[PDB]
Design a protein around this ligand. Structure first.
Ligand SMILES: Cn1ncc(C(=O)N2CCC2)c1C(=O)Nc1cc(-c2ccccn2)[nH]n1
Ligand SMILES: [Mg+2]
Ligand SMILES: [Zn+2]
Length: 313
């Protein structure tokens, strides 16, 4: 109870900033996550023995893939921490509880293949979940781990509070399906411009949390350029492996996943920043102004990708 998690000074200070990188020391990430729960939610909102066991079961159920791994989990959770600490009073206790866990669990048991590749492979999961295939699976994995003996970190919540947090986590994880992101941000864009946006309206809260989830999920594009650039290699390592697997199924993959179209990557990044990331953090900044540093960082990294194309690196 009187046991506070602490971090060395440089991390103590930098972890508060949107552009924080959690570092190459795997064994520190659990500690970094508990630190963030303790500062964001309180030291009393999870029994440490149950939280510690839950975290390590979540870690065990992430695969050793190049991008969709335990490091991605904790990175996405840190960006959510930075949003929550910069927008203190907007979020309920159950939202702070739910969303950090949502983020940590949001890619549980990812194989490093898209929903598209599962459907074309005809993977069993694609018969069980026709749309948002991996995302329904990640929610299903989250519930399984919550039901392991001694893992139920929500045990001391009322029956209704418990149902509310799992509903928050499910909507949060479903929203990381980027197919759902485009429609969600359009709706939020209209709602904000027309003045109809209302955070007392639950359906509107749900939309805002969906956007926050997209923003945290995409957060490699909001880092120092060397983090962004080197994370991009991991991202493309999964994409090219999927492109390889599409070729094995007899299907020419989209250029994004073709290791033969490596030359097209800089331009594909410009597309991605202009079509997905910049609009995401723009709308998020309008709805939550203290998240402006994510938009600024994203624009700086676009400008770095423009320099790669111009041959200035
Ligand atoms: C940076 N980042 N973060 C997440 C993602 C992303 O889409 N994710 C995470 C899994 C789904 C990206 C990304 O690079 N997306 C791209 C690349 C190209 C692209 C298009 C044509 C040619 C080359 N590349 N189009 N979209
Ligand atoms: Mg995902
Ligand atoms: Zn993710």
């Amino acid at each position: 109870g009187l046991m506070q998690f602490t971090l060395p000074v440089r991390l103590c200070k930098e972890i508060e900033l949107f552009h924080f990188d959690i570092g190459p020391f795997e064994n520190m990430w659990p500690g970094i996550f508990v630190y963030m729960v303790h500062r964001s939610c309180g030291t009393s909102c999870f029994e440490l023995e149950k939280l510690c066991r839950f975290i390590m079961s979540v870690k065990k159920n992430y695969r050793r893939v190049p991008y969709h791994n335990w490091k991605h989990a904790v990175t996405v959770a840190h960006c959510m921490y930075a949003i929550l600490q910069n927008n203190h009073t907007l979020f309920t206790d159950l939202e702070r509880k739910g969303l950090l866990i949502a983020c940590l669990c949001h890619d549980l048991d990812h194989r490093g293949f898209s929903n598209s590749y599962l459907q074309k492979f005809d993977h069993p999961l694609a018969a069980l979940y026709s749309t948002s295939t991996m995302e329904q699976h990640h929610f299903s994995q989250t519930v399984s781990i919550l039901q392991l003996e001694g893992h139920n970190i929500f045990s001391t919540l009322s029956s209704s509070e418990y149902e509310q947090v799992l509903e928050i986590i499910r909507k949060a994880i479903i929203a990381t399906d980027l197919a759902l992101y485009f429609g969600n941000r359009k709706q939020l864009e209209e709602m904000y411009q027309t003045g109809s946006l209302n955070l007392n309206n639950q359906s509107h809260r749900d939309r805002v949390i969906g956007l926050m989830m997209t923003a945290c999920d995409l957060c490699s594009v909001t880092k120092l350029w060397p983090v962004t650039k080197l994370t991009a290699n991991d991202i493309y390592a999964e994409f090219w492996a999927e492109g390889d697997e599409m070729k094995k199924l007899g299907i020419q993959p989209i250029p994004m996943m073709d290791r033969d179209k490596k030359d097209e990557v800089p331009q594909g990044q410009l597309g991605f920043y202009n079509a997905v990331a910049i609009p995401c953090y723009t709308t998020l900044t309008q709805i939550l102004p203290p998240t402006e540093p994510l938009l600024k960082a994203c624009r700086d990294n676009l400008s770095q990708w423009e320099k790669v194309i111009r041959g200035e690196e």
